[PDB]
Every structure is written in structure tokens, then in C-alpha cells.
Scaffold this active site. Structure first.
Site, mmCIF file in Angstrom:
data_model
loop_
_atom_site.group_PDB
_atom_site.id
_atom_site.type_symbol
_atom_site.label_atom_id
_atom_site.label_comp_id
_atom_site.label_asym_id
_atom_site.label_seq_id
_atom_site.Cartn_x
_atom_site.Cartn_y
_atom_site.Cartn_z
ATOM 1 N N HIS B 39 0.808 -1.223 0.000
ATOM 2 C CA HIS B 39 0.000 0.000 0.000
ATOM 3 C C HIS B 39 0.841 1.273 0.000
ATOM 4 O O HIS B 39 0.313 2.375 0.110
ATOM 5 C CB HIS B 39 -1.004 -0.009 1.161
ATOM 6 C CG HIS B 39 -0.477 -0.620 2.427
ATOM 7 N ND1 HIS B 39 0.087 0.130 3.437
ATOM 8 C CD2 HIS B 39 -0.461 -1.905 2.855
ATOM 9 C CE1 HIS B 39 0.445 -0.673 4.425
ATOM 10 N NE2 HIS B 39 0.135 -1.911 4.095
ATOM 11 N N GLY B 141 3.763 5.795 10.434
ATOM 12 C CA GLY B 141 5.046 5.701 9.766
ATOM 13 C C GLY B 141 5.842 4.452 10.073
ATOM 14 O O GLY B 141 6.958 4.308 9.557
ATOM 15 N N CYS B 143 4.957 1.258 9.324
ATOM 16 C CA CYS B 143 4.717 0.115 8.447
ATOM 17 C C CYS B 143 5.975 -0.251 7.678
ATOM 18 O O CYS B 143 6.763 0.610 7.258
ATOM 19 C CB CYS B 143 3.594 0.407 7.459
ATOM 20 S SG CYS B 143 1.985 0.519 8.280
HETATM 21 C C1 LIG Z 1 -11.127 3.536 9.277
HETATM 22 O O1 LIG Z 1 -9.877 2.893 9.249
HETATM 23 C C2 LIG Z 1 -9.446 2.430 10.490
HETATM 24 C C3 LIG Z 1 -10.275 2.423 11.610
HETATM 25 C C4 LIG Z 1 -9.797 1.943 12.833
HETATM 26 C C5 LIG Z 1 -8.495 1.468 12.936
HETATM 27 C C6 LIG Z 1 -7.660 1.481 11.788
HETATM 28 N N1 LIG Z 1 -6.374 1.070 11.638
HETATM 29 C C7 LIG Z 1 -6.013 1.267 10.394
HETATM 30 C C8 LIG Z 1 -4.647 0.956 9.855
HETATM 31 O O2 LIG Z 1 -3.856 0.427 10.560
HETATM 32 N N2 LIG Z 1 -4.342 1.334 8.505
HETATM 33 C C9 LIG Z 1 -3.018 1.031 7.999
HETATM 34 C C10 LIG Z 1 -3.023 1.184 6.478
HETATM 35 C C11 LIG Z 1 -3.819 0.061 5.813
HETATM 36 C C12 LIG Z 1 -3.991 0.334 4.318
HETATM 37 C C13 LIG Z 1 -3.193 -1.315 6.033
HETATM 38 C C14 LIG Z 1 -1.987 1.964 8.619
HETATM 39 O O3 LIG Z 1 -2.197 3.127 8.811
HETATM 40 N N3 LIG Z 1 -0.718 1.358 8.970
HETATM 41 C C15 LIG Z 1 0.346 2.150 9.537
HETATM 42 C C16 LIG Z 1 0.777 1.727 10.944
HETATM 43 C C17 LIG Z 1 -0.350 2.255 11.879
HETATM 44 C C18 LIG Z 1 -0.354 3.578 11.952
HETATM 45 C C19 LIG Z 1 -0.665 3.938 13.471
HETATM 46 N N4 LIG Z 1 0.005 2.738 14.243
HETATM 47 C C20 LIG Z 1 -0.240 1.707 13.453
HETATM 48 O O4 LIG Z 1 0.632 0.655 13.605
HETATM 49 C C21 LIG Z 1 1.496 2.221 8.540
HETATM 50 O O5 LIG Z 1 2.593 2.383 8.883
HETATM 51 C C22 LIG Z 1 1.077 2.653 7.160
HETATM 52 N N5 LIG Z 1 0.799 3.931 6.926
HETATM 53 C C23 LIG Z 1 0.415 4.240 5.616
HETATM 54 C C24 LIG Z 1 0.093 5.530 5.150
HETATM 55 C C25 LIG Z 1 -0.271 5.675 3.825
HETATM 56 C C26 LIG Z 1 -0.307 4.562 2.975
HETATM 57 C C27 LIG Z 1 0.010 3.278 3.431
HETATM 58 C C28 LIG Z 1 0.382 3.141 4.765
HETATM 59 S S1 LIG Z 1 0.839 1.789 5.729
HETATM 60 C C29 LIG Z 1 -7.056 1.827 9.668
HETATM 61 C C30 LIG Z 1 -8.126 1.949 10.588
#
Ligand SMILES: COc1cccc2[nH]c(C(=O)N[C@@H](CC(C)C)C(=O)N[C@@H](C[C@@H]3CCNC3=O)C(=O)c3nc4ccccc4s3)cc12
Ligand SMILES: COc1cccc2[nH]c(C(=O)N[C@@H](CC(C)C)C(=O)N[C@@H](C[C@@H]3CCNC3=O)C(=O)c3nc4ccccc4s3)cc12
Lengths: 299, 298
Positions: B39, B141, B143
Site C-alpha cells: 500500500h 510511519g 509500516c
Molecule cells: C477507518 O480505518 C481504520 C479504523 C480503525 C483502525 C484502523 N487502523 C487502520 C490501519 O492500521 N491502517 C493502515 C493502512 C492500511 C492500508 C493497512 C496503517 O495506517 N498502517 C500504519 C501503521 C499504523 C499507523 C498507526 N500505528 C499503526 O501501527 C502504517 O505504517 C502505514 N501507513 C500508511 C500511510 C499511507 C499509505 C500506506 C500506509 S501503511 C485503519 C483503521
């Protein structure tokens, strides 16, 4: 929110093995010097009352076997600084990080790189206790393992490992070879002074819990600093200073909870217990996160 | 006993950053391939239900900015494998360790090297829960940060970070991009299954207690594996597998306490409680130390 060590790679590149006679422990290789506990020169019949200057003058450079990985490093000189031996070697360590030697304060934390036979084994966080012990995980052969903090690629070394007390806690020196606490590098059973709880760290940890979405232990009450300290000292907690209150300022402003309001929360927890409840996964009040540790991790 | 991470240096040398547009994730540089969450190619209005195959066809090698520090590594190929992107680069990482990609089971522990913009920030030990989440410490940040074990200088990579659940626990993939558990890489609130206690690790903890002279809970009973598992599930404990019995083998031999005898001891603790007594100083039973961890520290 978890106990989090610094990445250990810059320090791993500095760990070597030091052998004198039958004794092998770890050393720290920075520029052309290897730092290691001086009792590497002791035999089993020396450990009880070692006269270190008299033992060291009898040793030659070639009595020291220093090994970095598979490479032997030739000792070209040696000097003793307190409980640390400084072996001059004929090769500077090409991966010497920017570094400093610091003596840390009780209540401060550091990362330990546990090492055996010059090979890093594990990394974990420790606090310098008020009685100058640390609650580490160290086995036979761990001496010379080091503790450190990292700040923008500069490694601040603060601990070298020497001893496990009968109680299972650990004692060591700074990198100038001066022990933390009243301990002595001889083969004797030594007791520490009575330990106390690091109050400012417990409060930082309560804030960390609030930052992470747990508020159950809060209450509607407040306390004065002195009234809190009277109760704290009764429960074998360290006094909370105005400097500590100021240091907690950023966490207070982040959560909107005044420091003395959090003191009132801790007072209630001390007097009422936790009643089987947990905070951030713990059934006990945790005192080995500093205010900086909380800020660094939560933000 | 301490939660002890593996020394992280061999993995620090493999961390890079991968940027598509303004989105920067962490990547893992091994030989001439960089692995990262797919992603990174998503824009903010693509995240609710990304059509990854469609999104990737609109990308070329020259849309990917891979950096070691500030040094760009030129991308010469790209492909998607499940939820990870594989970027072929023109430079083989000279610090590539001996490595393997492994898929772990619930209860197994590993070290997480938390990274932000390709720069390692901290290391800590995690256990894979039976519901296939980890209790991590990850911010925006993070991921692409990875989890790993190190055995005789071989790094076994087992985890890449993708997601924080609404409950605050974390979810991710193996290095082939297959999620642990029922999660999907979309911007969406997802629930894990009801978690359970890691029985095999509690048994390891009891063996650790016996090794250290704390053995009041040993009884003169035994059980069958099936009888134990039926009781365990009524207390929200994981059933034991044959693999669990075998990984307890070394501790059972060390102590002379048969695995099923220790199961009967645990069964008694479940049905009767600790009655104010403690084990290894704690009133609670620890379930995030594996049999390996116990041998490591004992
Ligand atoms: C309504 O949606 C929600 C409702 C309720 C809880 C929720 N949790 C998440 C969720 O986790 N999304 C994933 C992303 C998805 C696509 C896997 C995400 O933000 N991963 C983070 C690590 C996160 C961030 C906070 N500490 C966590 O470890 C990561 O580093 C990434 N950042 C980005 C930024 C831009 C593009 C790709 C990425 S991938 C969504 C969500
Ligand atoms: C009757 O004496 C005792 C009674 C009750 C409790 C006790 N504890 C110790 C004690 O700790 N001694 C020091 C050594 C002293 C000289 C500083 C010591 O063995 N350090 C270890 C790390 C230890 C080992 C177990 N896990 C710990 O962390 C280290 O690696 C070194 N080993 C040796 C072995 C031989 C020679 C030099 C070294 S230096 C003695 C003792």
C-alpha cells in the site's frame, strides 16, 4: 506501550572477547583501546582479595588474548583506570561510533547489550535503581557487557557489567571503572542498601497509560507536593522534587492532567491497592520508564 | 526473567525507505530486492478498498524512490506478492545476512525493530497471540518494520508491520505478504477473534519455576492431552498441539517432569486458582515466554 531498547548495532560492532589465563570475558573496542573489567587478570585463587596493581604489574602485553570475531588484536600496552582495564591494541576499530562516557543518575534508564564470549546475545532496557543496582539478566561470562543510550547516532556508554548479588540483582561500573553503589570487585557476597521506588517514573508511566487510552485509576482529588511526599516516603517511594514536577510538564500538558492530580491518583493506588486491576498490562506499579522514555515512545 | 530482544544490528543494516509520491514506508533490503507493504502505492482516496492490481499497472520502476539514508537505489523491476511489493534494485546489499523467511505460529516470540523513514528507533520482543495480533508499540510511519529471530547468525524474518486495530493491537504479514489472521490491508476498522492464553508458554513458565526451585504446584496427577484440552478451552486457554508437546521436550527432560504431568498441574491451577500463592514472584501466569526463551535465560 512496551519496554523498548535502543537498536544495538553500533555497539555490537564494538564487542570483543578478552582472555587472560583461564578467564574470558567481554570487552568494548573503541578506536585503538579495549575496555574490560580488570579482574580478567584474576585466577580463582585471586578473586577473594585481589591486589589489582600488584597483579597487573606482573602481566605482559602478550598475556592478553583479544579476539574481534575471528581476528586476534595484538595488545601493545595496558593501563588500569579504577575497576576497568584499558588494553591498547595495534588496530583501531573501523566501526567506532561517535561516543561518550557518561555516569548516569539513579532513576535513569539504559539499554543493556548482553554478551558472552564477545558475541552479543540479547538487548533489553534497565533502570539504575536508587540503591545503584540494576535488575538485569546476566549469566556466567556476561562480565564486560555494556549499557548505553543513543541520541542522534552518538552512543553514550554508561554501564559495564561486573557482578550478580546474592539477591539476583546486578552491579557494575561506569566506563571510568567506578562502581555504581557500595560494591567492590572481589568474590564476596554483597548486599545493597534498601531499595526504593522511582516515583517520577511511576508517574510518567501513569501518564503513558492515559496517552494510550486508560483512565480508570484517575480520581477527582488533588494533593499538595509535601502531602504527597509524606505518603510516598511511607510506602518507600523516592521523594518527588519540583524538578521532577517540571520534567513531567510535557506529559501533563499532553494529557491535560496536572502533575499533582496524577500524584493524587498514585496516592490512591498506594493506599487502596490496584484491587486485581491492571495498568498497561501490569499488576504492579512500574517504575522503569523515565519521562523521556514515555515521550520518546508515545510520540 | 526479562523480555530480551535479539541484537538488532544485522537487521538495521537492511532497513531502507520506499516512497511513492508523498507516502514513505520502511522496506527490507536483502540481496538486490527491497520488500515493503504494497500500500505504499496507495493514495488517500484509494485506501478504503484499493484495487492493488489496477494501482500497480499504473506504476513504473521510475515511480519508486528507494533510499538507504539519502542514497537512492535505482529500481529495475517491480512485482507484487500477496500484500508485499518486491522492488528489484540494481545494487545487492553488501550487509545482507544469512537469512530465511519463515511463517510463525501463535505463541512464538520474535524481536521487532521499529523503524521510521528507514531509520531504526527501538527494539523489543513480541509474542504472536492466538488471535494473530501482537501487542506492539507502533506509530504512524512504522509500516514495513520487521520482526525476526536470530539463530547462529541466520536471521529468520517472520513479520512485516501493516496495521493497528481499533483495540490498539497490531497486525501484519509474513515476508511473503500473507497476513497473520483474518485481516486485510485496507483503511477499515477490523476486529480480531477472541484472544486466548498461550498454554504452551504458560507450561514453559511453570518449567522455568521448577528449574528455579519454585515447585509447590506440582501434583501427583497426570492427564491425557485430549482431557486437558477440553478443560483448557473452558478457561480460555489454547489447546495444546503435538508440536507444543514436542517443544516442551527439552524442559521436561531437564526437570524430569513429564509434559502431561505438568498439564495436570496447570489444570489444577485453572480449576482451583493460586489461592494467594505466587509463582516466580508473580500472582499471574506469564504466557509470552516460549520454551526457547526459558532455556535462553535459565
Ligand atoms: C477507518 O480505518 C481504520 C479504523 C480503525 C483502525 C484502523 N487502523 C487502520 C490501519 O492500521 N491502517 C493502515 C493502512 C492500511 C492500508 C493497512 C496503517 O495506517 N498502517 C500504519 C501503521 C499504523 C499507523 C498507526 N500505528 C499503526 O501501527 C502504517 O505504517 C502505514 N501507513 C500508511 C500511510 C499511507 C499509505 C500506506 C500506509 S501503511 C485503519 C483503521
Ligand atoms: C562468594 O562470592 C559470591 C557470593 C555470592 C554472590 C556472588 N556474586 C559474585 C560475582 O558476581 N562475582 C563476579 C566476579 C567478581 C570478582 C567481580 C562475577 O562472577 N561476575 C560475572 C557475571 C556474574 C556471573 C553470574 N551472573 C553474574 O552476572 C562475570 O562475568 C565475571 N566472572 C568472573 C569469574 C572469575 C573471575 C572474574 C570474573 S568477571 C561473587 C559472589
Amino acid at each position: 506501550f512496551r519496554k523498548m531498547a535502543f537498536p544495538s548495532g553500533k555497539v555490537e560492532s564494538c564487542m570483543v572477547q578478552v582472555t587472560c589465563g583461564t578467564t574470558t570475558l567481554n570487552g568494548l573496542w573503541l578506536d585503538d583501546v579495549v575496555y574490560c573489567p580488570r579482574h580478567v587478570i584474576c585466577t580463582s585463587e585471586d578473586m577473594l582479595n585481589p591486589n589489582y596493581e600488584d597483579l597487573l604489574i606482573r602481566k605482559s602485553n602478550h598475556n592478553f588474548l583479544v579476539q574481534a570475531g575471528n581476528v586476534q588484536l595484538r595488545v601493545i600496552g595496558h593501563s588500569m583506570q579504577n575497576c576497568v582495564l584499558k588494553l591498547k591494541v595495534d588496530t583501531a576499530n573501523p566501526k567506532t561510533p561517535k561516543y561518550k562516557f557518561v555516569r548516569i543518575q539513579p532513576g535513569q534508564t539504559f539499554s543493556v547489550l548482553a554478551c558472552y564470549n564477545g558475541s552479543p546475545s540479547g538487548v533489553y532496557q534497565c533502570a539504575m535503581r536508587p540503591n545503584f543496582t540494576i535488575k538485569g539478566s546476566f549469566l556466567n561470562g556476561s562480565c564486560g557487557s555494556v549499557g548505553f543510550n543513543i541520541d542522534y547516532d552518538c552512543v553514550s556508554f554508561c554501564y559495564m557489567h561486573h557482578m550478580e548479588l546474592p539477591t539476583g540483582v546486578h552491579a557494575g561500573t561506569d566506563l571510568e571503572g567506578n562502581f555504581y553503589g557500595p560494591f567492590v570487585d572481589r568474590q564476596t557476597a554483597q548486599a545493597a542498601g534498601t531499595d526504593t521506588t522511582i516515583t517520577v517514573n511511576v508517574l510518567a508511566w501513569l501518564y503513558a497509560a492515559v496517552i494510550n487510552g486508560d483512565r480508570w485509576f484517575l480520581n477527582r482529588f488533588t494533593t499538595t507536593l509535601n502531602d504527597f511526599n509524606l505518603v510516598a516516603m511511607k510506602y518507600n517511594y523516592e521523594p518527588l522534587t519540583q524538578d521532577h514536577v517540571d520534567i513531567l510538564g510535557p506529559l501533563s500538558a499532553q494529557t491535560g492532567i496536572a502533575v499533582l492530580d496524577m500524584c493524587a491518583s498514585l496516592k490512591e493506588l498506594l493506599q487502596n491497592g490496584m484491587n486485581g486491576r491492571t495498568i498497561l498490562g501490569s499488576a504492579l506499579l512500574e517504575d522503569e520508564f523515565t519521562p523521556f522514555d514515555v515521550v520518546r515512545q508515545c510520540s
